[PDB]
Design an enzyme around this catalytic site. Structure first.
Site, short mmCIF file in Angstrom:
data_model
loop_
_atom_site.label_atom_id
_atom_site.label_comp_id
_atom_site.label_asym_id
_atom_site.label_seq_id
_atom_site.Cartn_x
_atom_site.Cartn_y
_atom_site.Cartn_z
N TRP A 101 0.84 -1.24 0.01
CA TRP A 101 0.00 -0.09 -0.02
C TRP A 101 0.89 1.21 -0.16
O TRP A 101 0.59 2.14 -0.66
CB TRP A 101 -1.11 -0.04 1.36
N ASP A 171 -1.06 6.75 6.08
CA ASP A 171 -2.27 6.15 5.95
C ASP A 171 -2.43 5.05 6.89
O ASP A 171 -1.84 4.25 7.03
CB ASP A 171 -1.96 5.06 4.38
N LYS A 195 -12.38 -0.56 6.42
CA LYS A 195 -11.43 -1.35 7.05
C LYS A 195 -11.97 -1.55 8.14
O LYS A 195 -12.45 -2.83 8.70
CB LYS A 195 -9.85 -1.05 6.97
C1 LIG Z 1 -7.51 -1.05 1.06
N1 LIG Z 1 -7.10 -2.52 1.14
C2 LIG Z 1 -7.91 -3.73 0.76
C3 LIG Z 1 -8.68 -3.75 -0.55
O1 LIG Z 1 -7.54 -4.08 -1.37
P1 LIG Z 1 -8.04 -4.52 -2.73
O2 LIG Z 1 -8.69 -5.90 -2.75
O3 LIG Z 1 -6.72 -4.71 -3.76
O4 LIG Z 1 -8.75 -3.22 -3.31
C4 LIG Z 1 -7.01 -5.04 1.21
O5 LIG Z 1 -7.59 -6.09 1.10
O6 LIG Z 1 -5.97 -4.98 1.59
C5 LIG Z 1 -6.49 0.08 1.60
C6 LIG Z 1 -6.23 1.17 0.58
C7 LIG Z 1 -7.10 1.54 -0.51
O7 LIG Z 1 -8.29 2.08 -0.07
P2 LIG Z 1 -9.44 2.37 -1.12
O8 LIG Z 1 -8.84 3.32 -2.18
O9 LIG Z 1 -10.01 1.04 -1.78
O10 LIG Z 1 -10.30 3.08 -0.32
C8 LIG Z 1 -5.43 2.04 1.04
N2 LIG Z 1 -4.56 1.88 2.05
C9 LIG Z 1 -4.50 0.95 2.83
C10 LIG Z 1 -3.70 0.55 4.04
C11 LIG Z 1 -5.67 0.05 2.44
O11 LIG Z 1 -5.83 -1.23 3.54
#
Ligand SMILES: *[C@H](N[C@@H](COP(=O)(O)O)C(=O)O)c1c(COP(=O)(O)O)cnc(C)c1O
Ligand SMILES: *[C@H](N[C@@H](COP(=O)(O)O)C(=O)O)c1c(COP(=O)(O)O)cnc(C)c1O
Ligand code: NA
Lengths: 360, 360
Positions: A101, A171, A195
């Site tokens: 991330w 983040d 989350k």
């Molecule tokens: C969100 N992470 C989730 C979802 O991931 P994907 O299945 O690839 O979409 C995870 O399963 O790890 C996340 C984000 C992204 O936020 P959004 O743009 O979707 O709101 C950003 N930073 C962190 C630390 C996240 O966990």
């Protein structure tokens, strides 16, 4: 019956919150309409978004000199909004990358400013957090960016680096409101709600007021912090229902006794799972360095990796769902956010003990 | 009791849809979780977004060669995404401006390419639509932008101009799914859902597939149409619950007989209110030219303008709320979207007749 839902986001929510939302969905507090039908320019929604902000300020002990923005677009939109707002195009941003991330934040920020990855965990498969004093920060960096809880890799900051030239940005999507945070140490904290604190569709930005303003000329109006701040998150139509849902979650976290009590419970239930892994004599494995093991996302693999699909399928038959790892890494991932019942982690632990007995 | 809610967006929703959402909120179809807890990568949510897309495709008769995207950020985010995706920075976009929403789209697009306002209704207070054959379109304009229903000013396109060099883009936020639309006339149709088809937090973009790709390098990944299209609106975490609600609305519009029947009902109830105004001997006034009077948003004023606050207060005491005009113009504005019951327009019309009698 409801299942134990180990999804990483969107994720499990408290049953009393869901039931409150059901109770009020047709007619909120005798207003004669649903939250989903309220004008964002009207007095009922005003009361909702204002109380969500004040409850969140109480929970995190947010100082008065910070703004709280409720925005659309996900944490991924903030990967663009942060450098567009906080940097000129020739400014530099320092990143510490402890999982994928933070890497995604780097790649988006490259569109808008210079980036320096001053440390990456990739050479040891994102299992560690750097020693901070050893970090070589860039003398003129506008800010230092971390991902406080790497949701896929299970690496969590338990203390924070001190930026040299500028401010700290984190983040906190996947550990948001899981524990106290000294907000004064940060210029910006942000996270998608889905989350740990609500349904998807809301992103929260906590930003020091003297950092708002002077976004780059190309910043879309919908990514401009000054626009959002001066309109109190009502510049355009906000995600009204998601903000309402976040407010229910915050109110309920205060009723639980606040984030010190939330952290106690998270620590307890995470200890049960990590101990079961560590006591399995290698049958289950967690690659993450002990001191930075996340309380929120627990990645683990099987020594017999070919058994992982059976594990996941049989766990789902036992009403424990969404335990497959993120697709990028495979293996398993138990996400055990605030609202995951203790009894769910106990059920997973007992399942794990039984699965090992049957496949060893 | 529930009120008649004349808000312009977010707005009134069907009671059967709200009650369906209420009964499934805690545990959707015995799946064991709320829609609000579902992983966007799991089969239950996939089933929901897929049906919402096909139901919308049925309703609007969307051709196969168009993509349907379910996004965050509001229509205001699309004011930036459209030129970022569809133009190079030295391309030109034509605008026909019939009210202030079109004006907001011009100002944002100017950050990203050149803009020509080839016709503007401002000089006659945004009360008319141009004669299309007489429009002076720019020879190399990439596209021609219209706002199909100007929500504050009550001006609605009944048919559409033919773009000379490029394709047609229409902001249909406040008349979306109010009537059939020949989508093949457009390169892009977009709209915030909260005016006519769901809660806020979702924006729909219908875009011809050969127009996707080659966004400007400064385009945030979250504003990039190819990213969203190739990931079927699941690039990051989508606004799951708003998409689900949109799906319930679309399903119910189909059950009502589709947009031909929806349009007939909209015309009927709009006629009651417009005829009441015209029959009021000047006591109430609608400034918009008759042929382009919106079926969705009906702005009107009082000849004795000092009575407007009493009108609004007495209406509210009679369970008719959010009748004040948009704050940029004042007056009154009756928004009478798809879900506004006929009985609510009838109550408004009767109240207007009584109000005039009492203030002759
Ligand atoms: C969100 N992470 C989730 C979802 O991931 P994907 O299945 O690839 O979409 C995870 O399963 O790890 C996340 C984000 C992204 O936020 P959004 O743009 O979707 O709101 C950003 N930073 C962190 C630390 C996240 O966990
Ligand atoms: C939404 N117009 C609504 C909301 O207006 P504000 O109170 O000024 O927010 C109205 O009352 O007129 C609208 C938009 C903007 O959509 P969002 O970005 O908020 O989703 C764009 N175009 C049209 C035609 C609108 O009605
Ligand atoms: Na039910």
């Amino acid at each position: 019956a409801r299942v134990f839902n180990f999804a990483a986001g969107p994720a499990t929510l408290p049953e009393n919150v869901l039931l409150k939302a059901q109770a009020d969905l047709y007619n909120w507090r005798g207003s004669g309409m649903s939250v989903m039908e309220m004008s964002h320019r009207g007095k009922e929604f005003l009361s909702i978004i204002q109380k969500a902000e004040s409850d969140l300020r109480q929970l995190l002990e947010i100082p008065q000199e910070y703004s709280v923005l409720f925005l659309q677009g996900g944490a991924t939109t903030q990967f663009a909004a942060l450098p567009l707002n906080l940097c000129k195009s020739d400014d530099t941003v320092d990143f510490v990358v402890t999982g994928s991330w933070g890497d995604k934040a780097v790649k988006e920020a490259k569109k808008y400013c210079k980036t320096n990855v001053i440390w990456s965990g990739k050479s040891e498969k994102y299992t560690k957090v750097p020693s901070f004093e050893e970090l070589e920060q860039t003398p003129d960096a506008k800010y230092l960016h971390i991902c406080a809880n790497e949701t896929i890799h299970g690496v969590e900051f338990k203390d924070y680096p001190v930026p040299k030239n500028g401010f700290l940005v984190a983040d906190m999507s996947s550990n948001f409101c899981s524990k106290p945070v000294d907000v004064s140490k940060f210029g910006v904290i942000y996270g998608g709600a889905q989350k740990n604190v609500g349904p998807s569709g809301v992103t929260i930005v906590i930003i020091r007021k003297d950092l708002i303003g002077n976004a780059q000329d190309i910043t879309p109006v919908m990514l401009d912090y000054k626009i959002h701040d001066e309109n109190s998150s009502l510049y355009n139509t906000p995600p009204c229902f998601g903000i309402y849902m976040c407010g229910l979650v915050f109110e309920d976290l205060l009723e639980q006794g606040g984030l010190k009590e939330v952290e106690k419970k998270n620590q307890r239930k995470a200890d049960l799972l990590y101990n079961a892994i560590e006591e399995s004599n290698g049958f289950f494995r967690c690659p993450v360095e002990k001191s930075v093991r996340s309380l929120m996302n627990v990645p683990f693999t099987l020594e017999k990796s070919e058994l992982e699909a059976e594990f996941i399928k049989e766990a789902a038959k036992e009403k424990m769902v969404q335990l497959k790892g993120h697709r990028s890494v495979g293996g398993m991932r138990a996400s055990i956010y605030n609202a995951m019942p203790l009894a769910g982690v106990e059920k997973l632990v007992a399942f794990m003990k039984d699965f090992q007995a049957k496949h060893a």
